[PDB]
Design an enzyme around this catalytic site. Sequence first.
Site, mmCIF file in Angstrom:
data_model
loop_
_atom_site.group_PDB
_atom_site.id
_atom_site.type_symbol
_atom_site.label_atom_id
_atom_site.label_comp_id
_atom_site.label_asym_id
_atom_site.label_seq_id
_atom_site.Cartn_x
_atom_site.Cartn_y
_atom_site.Cartn_z
ATOM 1 N N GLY A 1 0.814 -1.207 0.000
ATOM 2 C CA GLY A 1 0.000 0.000 0.000
ATOM 3 C C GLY A 1 0.842 1.249 0.000
ATOM 4 N N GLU A 2 0.175 2.396 -0.002
ATOM 5 C CA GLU A 2 0.846 3.688 0.065
ATOM 6 C C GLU A 2 1.186 3.976 1.528
ATOM 7 O OE1 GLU A 2 -0.328 8.028 -1.584
ATOM 8 O OE2 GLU A 2 0.127 6.598 -3.204
ATOM 9 N N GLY A 3 2.282 4.687 1.718
ATOM 10 C CA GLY A 3 2.767 5.145 3.010
ATOM 11 C C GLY A 3 3.210 6.587 2.878
ATOM 12 N N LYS B 1 10.015 0.722 1.416
ATOM 13 C CA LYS B 1 9.432 1.989 1.006
ATOM 14 C C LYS B 1 10.306 2.563 -0.078
ATOM 15 C CE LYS B 1 7.141 4.865 3.842
ATOM 16 N NZ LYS B 1 7.073 5.806 4.996
ATOM 17 N N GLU C 1 10.939 -3.367 9.003
ATOM 18 C CA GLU C 1 10.198 -4.534 9.474
ATOM 19 C C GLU C 1 8.841 -4.708 8.806
ATOM 20 O OE1 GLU C 1 10.497 -3.581 13.613
ATOM 21 O OE2 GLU C 1 11.878 -5.261 13.959
ATOM 22 N N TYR C 2 8.467 -5.960 8.553
ATOM 23 C CA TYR C 2 7.173 -6.278 7.936
ATOM 24 C C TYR C 2 6.167 -6.639 9.027
ATOM 25 C CZ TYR C 2 3.630 -9.040 5.340
ATOM 26 O OH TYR C 2 2.446 -9.541 4.852
ATOM 27 N N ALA C 3 5.016 -5.941 9.027
ATOM 28 C CA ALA C 3 3.898 -6.141 9.964
ATOM 29 C C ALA C 3 2.760 -6.710 9.147
ATOM 30 C CB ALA C 3 3.483 -4.814 10.573
ATOM 31 N N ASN D 1 -2.652 -2.322 9.704
ATOM 32 C CA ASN D 1 -2.834 -1.298 10.710
ATOM 33 C C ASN D 1 -3.754 -1.741 11.859
ATOM 34 O OD1 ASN D 1 -5.549 0.115 10.521
ATOM 35 N ND2 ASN D 1 -4.819 0.642 8.471
ATOM 36 N N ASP E 1 0.761 12.815 15.038
ATOM 37 C CA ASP E 1 -0.287 12.019 14.384
ATOM 38 C C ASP E 1 -0.532 10.586 14.990
ATOM 39 O OD1 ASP E 1 -2.369 11.632 12.473
ATOM 40 O OD2 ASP E 1 -0.983 11.129 10.846
ATOM 41 N N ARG F 1 -4.504 3.928 13.005
ATOM 42 C CA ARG F 1 -4.106 3.755 11.600
ATOM 43 C C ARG F 1 -2.575 3.827 11.451
ATOM 44 N NH1 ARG F 1 -6.503 9.096 11.919
ATOM 45 N NH2 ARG F 1 -4.791 10.621 11.837
ATOM 46 N N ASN F 2 -1.898 4.488 12.409
ATOM 47 C CA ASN F 2 -0.446 4.674 12.393
ATOM 48 C C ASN F 2 0.288 3.638 13.217
ATOM 49 O OD1 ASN F 2 -0.286 6.942 10.460
ATOM 50 N ND2 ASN F 2 -1.171 8.184 12.074
ATOM 51 N N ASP G 1 5.179 5.990 12.830
ATOM 52 C CA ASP G 1 5.483 7.400 12.563
ATOM 53 C C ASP G 1 6.608 7.897 13.480
ATOM 54 O OD1 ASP G 1 3.810 8.883 10.343
ATOM 55 O OD2 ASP G 1 3.847 10.493 11.842
HETATM 56 C C1 LIG Z 1 1.282 2.849 8.491
HETATM 57 C C2 LIG Z 1 1.705 2.374 7.163
HETATM 58 C C3 LIG Z 1 1.042 1.426 6.346
HETATM 59 C C4 LIG Z 1 1.827 1.315 5.223
HETATM 60 C C5 LIG Z 1 1.698 0.494 3.997
HETATM 61 N N1 LIG Z 1 0.396 -0.159 3.899
HETATM 62 C C6 LIG Z 1 0.379 -1.488 4.370
HETATM 63 N N2 LIG Z 1 -0.747 -2.180 4.154
HETATM 64 C C7 LIG Z 1 -0.785 -3.444 4.593
HETATM 65 C C8 LIG Z 1 0.270 -4.029 5.243
HETATM 66 BR BR1 LIG Z 1 0.120 -5.840 5.802
HETATM 67 C C9 LIG Z 1 1.391 -3.242 5.462
HETATM 68 N N3 LIG Z 1 2.481 -3.774 6.161
HETATM 69 C C10 LIG Z 1 3.633 -3.150 6.571
HETATM 70 C C11 LIG Z 1 4.006 -1.793 6.338
HETATM 71 C C12 LIG Z 1 5.233 -1.647 6.952
HETATM 72 C C13 LIG Z 1 6.198 -0.555 7.163
HETATM 73 C C14 LIG Z 1 5.946 0.717 6.388
HETATM 74 C C15 LIG Z 1 6.902 1.789 6.864
HETATM 75 C C16 LIG Z 1 6.710 2.440 8.073
HETATM 76 C C17 LIG Z 1 7.593 3.416 8.508
HETATM 77 C C18 LIG Z 1 8.683 3.762 7.729
HETATM 78 C C19 LIG Z 1 8.880 3.120 6.520
HETATM 79 C C20 LIG Z 1 7.997 2.143 6.097
HETATM 80 N N4 LIG Z 1 5.514 -2.860 7.499
HETATM 81 N N5 LIG Z 1 4.565 -3.782 7.295
HETATM 82 N N6 LIG Z 1 1.445 -1.987 5.015
HETATM 83 O O1 LIG Z 1 2.897 2.152 5.362
HETATM 84 N N7 LIG Z 1 2.826 2.822 6.586
#
Ligand SMILES: Cc1cc(CNc2ncc(Br)c(Nc3cc(CCc4ccccc4)n[nH]3)n2)on1
Lengths: 279, 279
Positions: free
Chosen positions: A26-28, A52, A100-102, A106, A146, A150-151, A164
């Site tokens: 997704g967008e960030g 990113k 890191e991957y989450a 959100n 913020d 959602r963050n 954030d």
């Molecule tokens: C808040 C937010 C949501 C998004 C992207 N949208 C999204 N949708 C579904 C999933 Br599942 C998912 N996972 C995920 C995103 C990240 C780090 C992003 C990042 C955060 C901080 C700095 C750099 C990168 N890690 N794991 N992300 O970016 N910021």
Amino acid sequence: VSEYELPEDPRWELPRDRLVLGKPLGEGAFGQVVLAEAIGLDPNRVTKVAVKMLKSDATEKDLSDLISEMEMMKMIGKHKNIINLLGACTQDGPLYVIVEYASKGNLREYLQARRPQLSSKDLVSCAYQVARGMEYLASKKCIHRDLAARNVLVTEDNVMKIADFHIDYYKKTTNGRLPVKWMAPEALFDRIYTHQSDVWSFGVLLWEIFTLGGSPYPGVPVEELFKLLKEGHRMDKPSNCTNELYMMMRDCWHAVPSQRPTFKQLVEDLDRIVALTSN
Amino acid sequence: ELPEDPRWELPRDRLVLGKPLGEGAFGQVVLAEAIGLDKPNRVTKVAVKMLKSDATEKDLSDLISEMEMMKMIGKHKNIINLLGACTQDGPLYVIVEYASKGNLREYLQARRPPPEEQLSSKDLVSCAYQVARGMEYLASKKCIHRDLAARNVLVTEDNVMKIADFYYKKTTNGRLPVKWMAPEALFDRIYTHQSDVWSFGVLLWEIFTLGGSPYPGVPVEELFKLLKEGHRMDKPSNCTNELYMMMRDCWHAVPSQRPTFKQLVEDLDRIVALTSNQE
Ligand SMILES: Cc1cc(CNc2ncc(Br)c(Nc3cc(CCc4ccccc4)n[nH]3)n2)on1
Ligand SMILES: Cc1cc(CNc2ncc(Br)c(Nc3cc(CCc4ccccc4)n[nH]3)n2)on1
């Protein structure tokens, strides 16, 4: 500079061959986020990571914002409850900020999908974790401005990770919600942003946890929110939420910022509450 | 001249007009003493409605019709009852029961924790039971209220609830009457016992918020939106899930699915007996 090239940083640099880009997530802030596989970030092990990068329609300004976010993440240091920097591809090609991957997305979306799957203890642990991440960011002299569900991102192992590190009042999000609803009156009216204004936002975030991703002040326009806050009006106690946790929300929403608890106090109170709460 | 009705007529000398109580529907209300309403030597404190000096021929006909309707309705403990009238040789005086503690909205607000003595959970459910009983009586007399709100409920010295008066205009307290209206009454001007049930649900929310203002910060146009899309008020902070389910049932989109006043009376009777007076 950085029109043709970015400066190196061998501490964080990952060869591009050790990163296999996958599906878009997704967008960030500052660009787009994609899922990826990386070989040995910190040696022969593969890790699913988030990457990113700038959108193809980005300008020099967008690039400088992405670099500054990467630079700030190097400065912040590691914490369990924040999205941590893992690496970067800065040389010979687009900038990739590897973090890191989450997997569970959100926190707002995570709580809504679990509406009648989450015990009272799970909800308090979620709040404890966000408070811990906030306390860490505050100690690193970082003001979020913020803080909202959602963050906050949720990993496969249910770990809460904060994402954030003239501003518009009428601007709406993807789920059609006004960020002003998470703002302290002093930030809203006087543009004063402190750790104490982030404490107010944490109180709103507590309400989102206890309503399982509920929408603050629904149907209340920006101008009417201003009058309700000035009038000393506060959001109602979410159904099934304890009086103790509502008192915490109300404390976070004290009009005098010095009267609100600190993130250090919220962490101690939440730690105690988690141990006493039933699953 | 008005025609005489010996059933209700009281000689003008038998009524000693006292202090003004406030404005009411169709005129002004004053406190008074009626000599020999029943023993002929006993005085009774009564409320007297009369026209304001700036009233029109429409105002007079509306006052007469309210008096005529009250004659037909018959007696009930939970409604403001007609006691008499001075219709000959002077201004029209509609003599009714005196409710010393004023309207329910003001009664509940004065009893909020800081002013008058706090009300127990049982007192609040009993208050709702009494309004439901008055409404059930009016419904059996084929009477449609159209304006059930805590402001239209009066409280006696003995804490007896008595119902009285059976899009951008604001009341003395700055509240929009549209906030008590069912969508079908709001949009199609269809008033039924089922639309009064919707209003009773709003009244329940006012009791449980101790005189709270419905849909705070929501403008008229946004209320229309929210209702159409199925949005409802939050559960009051101090309210059981059972009592919130009752409110929600009163707020059913399909009027035929709302409980009747007969069902509300039975449920409230059972809830009152189960509710504690210990908090
Ligand atoms: C808040 C937010 C949501 C998004 C992207 N949208 C999204 N949708 C579904 C999933 Br599942 C998912 N996972 C995920 C995103 C990240 C780090 C992003 C990042 C955060 C901080 C700095 C750099 C990168 N890690 N794991 N992300 O970016 N910021
Ligand atoms: C509703 C509402 C409030 C008012 C007048 N304002 C007021 N303020 C303080 C006190 Br205390 C008080 N008491 C009271 C009012 C009445 C009967 C009114 C009536 C109703 C129908 C027909 C004739 C007279 N009985 N006892 N009334 O009129 N309708």
